[PDB]
Each structure stands twice: as C-alpha cells, then as structure tokens.
C-alpha cells in the first residue's frame, strides 16, 4: 500500500470531557478511510456516536454513519474504520487540506480539525501517456512550475520510483543525463487535477530537486510535502 501516518490525537480527552479520538487516513484498494480510535478516559459510559465533516476543498464526506453501535465504557479503546468519498460539498480551505470535523456523543458535540495527507487523494489512474506528458508539460503556463528540495534523502532512483508508485505517483520515463538521474512523474488527485513532476537525483549530493507542474500550483506545496514523507518513511 501507500504510506500511512501513525495516528495522532485529533481530540484530546481534556477538550471533550474525557473523549479522546486519534486518527489517520488510508487509501486501500482504491477507497479512502478515516482510521480512528476512540478511547473513553472519562468517568462514565458514552453512547449516541455520530460524525459530520464540514465543507472542504476536496469535498470529502463519509460514506456511512459512524459504526460504533456500542456503549463505550471507561478506559475502553476502539478502532473505527470510516469509509469516505469525495462527492460532498466542496469549499477551498486554508490550509488547503484542513478538514473540520464534529463528533457527537450522549454528552456533547465536539469540534476538531485534522489535515488530510494528500496522498490518500491520489487516484489509481494518474499514469499519464508519455506524449501526453510531453505535450502537457509543454502546455502548463511556465510560472505554474515550482521547484522543491527533498532534503537528506539517500535512496536510489529505482527505490524512489518504487516507493512513489506505491502511492500512485507514476514514473513515466527515466533519463540519465550527466550522471544525474531524471524521473518523469504524473499524479492525478480525486477532483481531477493533474500534477506532473520531474525528479532529479545526483550521486554526491543527498538532496533531490523536485520540479512540479500543476494547473492549480497552490496544490504543489502539499504534493512535495507528501513526496517528503513518502521517501522518508
């Protein structure tokens, strides 16, 4: 599969009268899940669990209600796997990948925010055709090209192209010019937006240069960030 961040407290217990929630996001067999854990660090049982996502850039929405049809007892801890889809109300957020969430129990409604790792939103179908890559790279306005440095990374081209493909970032073509390795790479997000990349590897220096061309280039920062976490874990 792709890279999955270890979960992280999203809702501290002290901010929700003992209800602690922690989570991550996954993309497995082309379906997106919010992978949660609820722990009851409160004095009494918790019931009537429910979830709502607010309006967000990628129009992310759960596919079912929260399936925890159970009383959550003190010091009890459970893993919930909430399926998601991107058919819901869209609205460009700041930061672009911030999701506002509200969880309800018998006690109250609690609000929290978390950042969707953009790689879970990369679709299985992001491998551009080479001539189409060529022409599209030529096509995107040239001020829509952005340059990034992948720091202290020591993996070779094969390993980089391998890791990256596990996350639906495709390696279209490979060019070795001047002992510097060059990888051409497309990815497609869930809202259709393409990201084309040229990644540049050179023995000697443990810093990779990442050239991203996207039609909405405000995305590209978040794409690099994801390149960085992928190639570092």
């Amino acid at each position: 599969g792709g890279y999955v961040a270890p979960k992280a407290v999203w809702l501290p217990a002290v901010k929700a009268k003992g209800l602690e929630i922690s989570g991550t996001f996954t993309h497995r067999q082309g379906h997106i899940y919010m992978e949660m854990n609820f722990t009851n660090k409160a004095l009494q049982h918790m019931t009537d669990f429910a979830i709502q996502f607010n309006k967000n850039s990628f129009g992310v929405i759960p596919s079912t209600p929260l399936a925890i049809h159970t009383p959550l007892m003190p010091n009890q801890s459970i893993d919930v796997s909430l399926p998601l889809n991107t058919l819901g109300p869209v609205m460009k957020m700041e930061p672009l990948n911030n999701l506002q969430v509200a969880v309800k129990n018998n006690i109250d409604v609690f609000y929290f925010s978390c950042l969707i790792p953009l790689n879970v939103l990369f679709v299985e179908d992001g491998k551009m055709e080479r001539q189409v890559f060529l022409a599209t790279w030529k096509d995107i306005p040239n001020e829509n090209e952005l340059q990034f440095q992948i720091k202290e990374c020591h993996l070779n081209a094969d390993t980089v192209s391998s890791k990256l493909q596990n996350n639906n970032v495709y390696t279209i073509a490979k060019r070795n010019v001047e002992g510097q390795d060059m990888l051409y790479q497309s990815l497609k997000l869930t809202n259709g937006i393409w990201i084309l990349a040229e990644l540049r590897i050179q023995p000697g220096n443990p810093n990779y240069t990442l050239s991203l061309k996207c039609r909405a280039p405000e995305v590209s920062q978040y794409i690099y960030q994801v390149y960085d976490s992928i190639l570092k874990n």
Partner: peptide
C-alpha cells in the same frame, strides 16, 4: 463555531 447539525428528529 457551530457549523454542525445533529438533530434528534430529522426526516
């Protein structure tokens, strides 16, 4: 900030 619903009747 109160964007969420959760109403006990809802049909």
């Amino acid at each position: 900030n109160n964007w969420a619903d959760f109403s006990s009747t809802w049909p």
